[PDB]
Nucleic acid binder design. Structure first.
Lengths: 87, 94, 60, 102, 35, 147
RNA sequence: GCGUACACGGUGGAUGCCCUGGCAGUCAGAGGCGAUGAAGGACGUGCUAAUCUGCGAUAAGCGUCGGUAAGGUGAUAUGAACCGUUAUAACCGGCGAUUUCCGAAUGGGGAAACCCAGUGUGUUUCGACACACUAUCAUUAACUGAAUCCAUAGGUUAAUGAGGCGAACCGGGGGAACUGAAACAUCUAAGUACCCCGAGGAAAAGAAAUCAACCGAGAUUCCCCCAGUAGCGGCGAGCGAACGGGGAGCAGCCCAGAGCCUGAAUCAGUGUGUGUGUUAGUGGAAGCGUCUGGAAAGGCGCGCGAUACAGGGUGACAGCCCCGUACACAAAAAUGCACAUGCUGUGAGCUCGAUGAGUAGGGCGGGACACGUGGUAUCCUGUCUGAAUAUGGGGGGACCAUCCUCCAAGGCUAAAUACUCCUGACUGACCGAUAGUGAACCAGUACCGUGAGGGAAAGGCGAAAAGAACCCCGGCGAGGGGAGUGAAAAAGAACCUGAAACCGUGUACGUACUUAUAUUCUGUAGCAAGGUUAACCGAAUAGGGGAGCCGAAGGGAAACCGAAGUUGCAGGGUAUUUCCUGUCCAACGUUAAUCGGGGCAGGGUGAGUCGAAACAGGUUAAUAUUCCUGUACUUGGUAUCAAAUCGUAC
């Protein structure tokens, strides 16, 4: 994991939803979009490097797009923090 | 002379025509009283059209509200995709 | 602008481009996703800057 | 090489603005020229609660073709042709009738 | 899966018949030659 | 009848004096019109006869003028305009021998004025214009070619 | 209740008008692209929900050099937000980097855009990540090297031309039926449709042992005439020539073995400098008043340039409004053609001898040649025979005699020539949305079918969106009426003019043989015993081009005596994600449904203990033993950390 350009190209932008809004206060959990790969360790390392927030468990799932036109399937990641919070 | 036309009405032409035939040539108030208790579906549409016409007439021709008289009410076949229809009402004091 | 950064060595170019990618791109994406960033010219500016920077470091 | 540019005085040859002079503000990418006080319009803006709606009817300016307007020179008081001539280092526009320099 | 095995792009392109029908479809210009 | 030098010109009777042949002229003009790349060949003698007949018809109507020379000192259309205004000619043709570069260049823009050499004369040019101005050298060249 | 005519309206799509589209040709390029990754597709590509277009993680763009440069951030199609305005906004062009995946695909598997490998190098952290390389013939030499000691067959090594797509054409090999004979065998059908092969932009052929015979010119390649003539053909339909006589072009050479003098024109590739084109571009003339007219470019009056009245736009038809045209100029760098110029190799002619030996021919058997082996002509066989070399050979027209180009067993030959997938320019007595293309429109799209394949309808507002502010009724919808912009709303987006057919109220009264090859007749016109000249040259329907097709001072028995036809034309006849949330009843429910078995936008799937290891509770509108609550459990590394991707709704 010497190279740092690869990890920073995984996460794209956060996801905003009512469930995410409730989770941000229920357990300080956040939802961040990631690339095709589902490398949990790399995602945790990138989050630690960027936001300087410690992470203990990351939950990854896959979501398929809805239609002919098609959209690339995207990986949803839930990340929880002990006590720190970040935008 | 107040003109009010409702287009693309979702009702068969014959029913609306035969409903309106009972209102042509009669006083606005008397026709309204008759159609208050009417149960036909087209009765609601014709009531809407005539009340809109009377409201427009009063807004622009408020003078002589009492003597409003139904003058020229008719129904015409509308666009076909349940054929639609256009309901037209021309009302004036005389 | 076009040639101001041509003279500086490769190490500082790499440092600047990696710093930009790590800070500016992420901040702009966060603001866009959160509804902020009423002005979006920053994204285009940083994209053009990084494209120019990475176009170098290979022919040099 | 447009004959009309910002900060210039012109006169509308035709289009309900005959004999009335104006100042050009900007020229559209399609060639349309906007000149102060040539064609007043009463466009009805669509109401919108946000964006600080001015309200009422906005009195803006319409757009007319450059063909219907001509450059005006105060030297003679009448519209004439405008050409391009090479100066010592650059190229600049000039009028006709002794070719007053711009 | 039988449809994919039978009329699949590779299944056709394996034989000359698939190549010629692909050329004809390209000449016609349909959006999808096989599926 | 040169109209500028009071000099008479000798012309063959068979050229400007032969009987007019309406049918032959009609056939020649129809063939020429149809020979404009739309779906006709005309015999040489028939073409010569048609040209001579039309020239005679124009001569007997006083629609043809002959001058000693016709040239412009400079290739300026104003000179040609003044020259044609002198004779009060607006829609006329110029027929000469060797084509003058200056005259042809000046007359290019004039829709009502066209200049042609002796070898490049056609019935359409003669008929489309009210009058034609010709030169003695052009006259003898036409006499030789048409025979 | 109906009818006799009109007005007011509706589904209404013929006529009239518009073309940002097609159809038929001419002139030049190119006449092919591609593993250094072709054509065609999937996916991303902006401040953005969808499309054209550009682009490919650098993703409507990046670096360098030139033109314009004050507007621009491509448009549909607005809005928010920025840069620059006299040279670092933006646009166009040359030169470069990047150039996702599938696609000959060529690392393996495989289902197109999917999953997973091996080698070297790069390694602030050798867990992870980045660049290059991959499957085929033999040739150069090598590592080498069984049968079989050497040697061979064979494996590897660094490079070379290829293993795909694309409209037509060259030539060759296969290759049916439909047809006339009112059916049929030989022919025609038809060498037609179709498949393959060599490279090509053109291809094959291309310079005589060829023809008539006692007289001649000899390259091939296309064209009118010869000639639609002979001949063939149930001499019927129909097919169909050449030595011969004119145009485009016309160049014949190399080795054949020895030398002489030789680096002597010149061939083939690479620098230098000029000119003319391409790839951005600059300059480039002239007017008003007056009257209708919404707006003039329309009528009227007087003037101007014209080397430029070709064309388009501009509130109606514009030389004098603009863009443009002719004309005069322009290239930092790339690029085709011309030359003088430098270099690595063949690179002038002369003499000596010659015409390419198992060669032509012939005998055992068959190929398409009508001729299947018949009297049988053409390359040759599995096989045998087989003399020479200008002193010899082939051919004949009666053979002997005598004549003719030439020398066959080694090769080449750009010139005139067929065609257009594509690029640039123009034209059309071609069409106006049921026409023209299958498609003028998000069309080779919707739709049908397992695939193959088949294949539509739908174009139009307004000069300028100036797109009806504002108010009211109404259900906050839908719809309508005032006011207003607008010429016109008898132009209101379901937006040009709008007839009938069909349905409503009022008004007056009763109750379809085609171009074309020939034959014949009618009119008309030039010339005149002559004219008619095809293909071609050509400043282009001018002038040349009489190698032809007809008639004639001839007629006649070939003893004798001594005049008028053709071609231009016009006319005619004949022969042929379903789970929930917000919206709605409009496509459907055999009435309505504001209900749903129905569309749209959003959300939802959480794993070491679900596939050696987890039990109970809570969770949202839908997921859990996965998220939190109590901790427990299998394994490994260092009290501490870790155990990947993949689906958890229906």
């Amino acid at each position: 994991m010497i190279r740092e350009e690869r990890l920073l190209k995984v996460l794209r932008a956060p996801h905003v939803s009512e469930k995410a809004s409730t989770a941000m206060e229920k357990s300080n959990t956040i939802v961040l979009k990631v690339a095709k790969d589902a490398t949990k360790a790399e995602i945790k390392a990138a989050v630690q490097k960027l936001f300087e927030v410690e992470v203990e468990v990351v939950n990854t799932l896959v979501v398929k797009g809805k239609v002919i036109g098609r959209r690339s399937d995207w990986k949803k990641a839930y990340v929880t923090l002990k006590e720190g919070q970040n935008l | 002379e107040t003109i009010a036309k409702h287009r693309h009405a979702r009702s068969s032409a014959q029913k609306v025509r035969l409903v309106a035939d009972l209102i042509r040539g009669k006083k606005v108030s008397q026709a309204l009283d008759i159609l208050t208790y009417t149960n036909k579906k087209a009765a609601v549409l014709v009531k809407k059209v005539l009340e809109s016409a009377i409201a427009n007439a009063e807004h622009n021709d408020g003078a002589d509200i009492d003597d409003l008289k139904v003058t020229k009410i008719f129904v015409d076949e509308g666009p076909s995709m349940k054929r639609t229809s256009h309901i037209t009402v021309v009302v004036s004091d005389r | 602008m076009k040639a101001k950064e041509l003279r500086e060595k490769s190490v500082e170019e790499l440092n600047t481009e990696l710093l930009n990618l790590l800070r500016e791109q992420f901040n702009l994406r966060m603001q866009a996703a959160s509804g902020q960033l009423q002005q979006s010219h920053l994204l285009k500016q940083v994209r053009r800057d990084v494209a120019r920077v990475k176009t170098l470091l290979n022919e040099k | 090489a447009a004959k009309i540019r910002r900060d210039d005085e012109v006169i509308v040859l035709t289009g309900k603005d005959k004999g009335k002079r104006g100042k050009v503000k900007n020229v559209l990418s399609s060639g349309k020229v906007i000149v102060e006080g040539i064609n007043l319009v009463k466009k009805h803006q669509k109401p919108v609660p946000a964006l600080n709606q001015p309200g009422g009817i906005v009195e803006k300016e319409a757009a007319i073709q450059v063909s219907n307007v001509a450059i005006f020179n105060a030297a003679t008081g009448k519209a004439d042709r405008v050409g391009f001539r090479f100066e010592d280092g650059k190229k600049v526009r000039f009028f006709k009738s002794n070719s007053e320099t711009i | 899966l039988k449809r994919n095995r039978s009329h699949g792009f590779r299944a056709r392109m394996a034989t000359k018949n698939g190549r010629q029908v692909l050329a004809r479809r390209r000449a016609k210009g349909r959006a999808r030659l096989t599926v | 009848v040169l109209k500028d030098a009071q000099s008479a010109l000798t012309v063959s009777e068979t050229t400007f004096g032969r009987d007019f042949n309406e049918a032959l002229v009609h056939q020649v003009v129809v063939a020429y019109a149809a020979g404009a790349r739309q779906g006709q060949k005309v015999n040489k003698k028939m073409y010569r006869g048609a040209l001579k007949s039309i020239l005679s018809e124009l001569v007997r109507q006083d629609r043809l003028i002959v001058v000693e020379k016709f040239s412009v000192e400079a290739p300026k259309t104003k000179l040609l305009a003044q020259k044609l205004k002198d004779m009060a000619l607006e829609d006329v043709l110029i027929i000469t021998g060797e084509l003058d570069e200056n005259l042809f260049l000046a007359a290019r823009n004039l829709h009502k004025v066209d200049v042609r050499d002796a070898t490049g004369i056609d019935p359409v040019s003669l008929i489309a214009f009210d009058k034609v101005v010709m030169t003695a050298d052009a006259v003898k060249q036409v006499e030789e070619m048409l025979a």
